């Protein structure tokens, strides 16, 4: 494995996905993001391309991986929030686990909240 | 002393506000300043902002040679906080962005908001 030289640093920011929506109005649950390069270091940020529910769908996310730092916030009604970030390292099999805490006023058919994963392509990252 | 590859971290704490429009349809530019000269960055949108409920659309590109991508904001019903731009800062630590806005109302608009991410590795 030949490391990418520092002078050749670039960011890959095209890995996007969906957070699994809640089945209850108040829920705490986990989701495993899979298929990441094992042991690579990432920043995950929220983004939004999503019709507002207009029923106050609040979601907060943290990461369960060792040494992960930060928190992500979504809110879709009036005071829109698409905020925060988590720095984390994928585990030895290319997975990271997150904890979702949701508090939705209505949850008939919730549209997923959306994330983007950012990876510096440098060294063996 | 350069940062060796095994000590890669990210700094994602530089945030800022995009200059807001004064006409309903407007094109303008903004110089972002105070970046490490010649370092490579990624800029992403974020939102922590009360919606205008009057269809404030903003589209952003970067004028820097080497820049790639585009950012979109929209605050009413079909919400957009989307896209990204990868770019290098210039020799004096700056980058120029072009904003194209299409706002159904523009009475004292609240800025759209951004986050700059830097990989801390090598001399970046």
Author numbering:
A (entry chain B): 2 to 126
B (entry chain A): 3 to 126
Sentences from the paper on this structure:
A major factor that limits the expansion of shrimp cultures is, however, infectious diseases from viruses, such as P. vannamei nodavirus (PvNV) and M. rosenbergii nodavirus (MrNV), which have inflicted heavy economic losses. The Nodaviridae genome comprises two single-stranded positive-sense RNA that encode the capsid protein for viral capsid assembly, the RNA polymerase for RNA replication, and the B2 protein for host RNA interference suppressor. While the shell domains (S-domains) of PvNV and MrNV contain conserved sequences of 62% identity, the protrusion domains (P-domains) and N-arms show low sequence identities of only 17% and 43%, respectively. In this work, we have determined the cryo-EM structures of T = 3 and T = 1 PvNV-LPs at atomic resolution, the crystal structures of the P-domains of PvNV and MrNV (PvNVPd and MrNVPd), and the crystal structure of the S-domain of PvNV (ΔN-ARM-PvNVSd) in the T = 1 subviral particle (SVP).
As for the MrNvPd, three crystal forms (P3221, C2221, and P4332) were determined. The overall conformations and dimer interfaces in three crystal structures of MrNVPd are similar with a RMSD < 0.3 Å. The MrNVPd has a structural fold consisting of eight long stretches of antiparallel β-strands similar to the PvNVPd, but shares a low sequence homology with PvNVPd. In addition, the MrNVPd dimer is stabilized with hydrogen bonds between Leu255 and Tyr257 of the β1 strand and Lys287 and Ile289 of the β3 strand. Second, two MrNVPd dimers (C2221) in an asymmetric unit form an X-shaped model with the antiparallel β-strand interaction through an extensive network of hydrogen bonds between residues from two β-strands β2 (Gln273–Asp278) and two turns β1/β2 (Val266–Pro267). The two dimers in the X-shaped model are orientated with a tilt angle of 130° and with separation of ~63 Å between the two linker terminals. Notably, the sequence of the interaction region (Gln273–Asp278) of MrNVPd is distinct from that of PvNVPd, and two types (P21 and P212121) of PVNVPd structures do not exhibit the X-shaped conformation. It appears that the X-shaped dimeric MrNVPd organization reveals no homology compared with intermolecular P-domain conformations of other viral capsids. Although the X-shaped model is observed only in the MrNVPd structure, we speculate that this organization might both exist also on the T = 3 MrNV and PvNV virions under various environment even high salt or low pH.
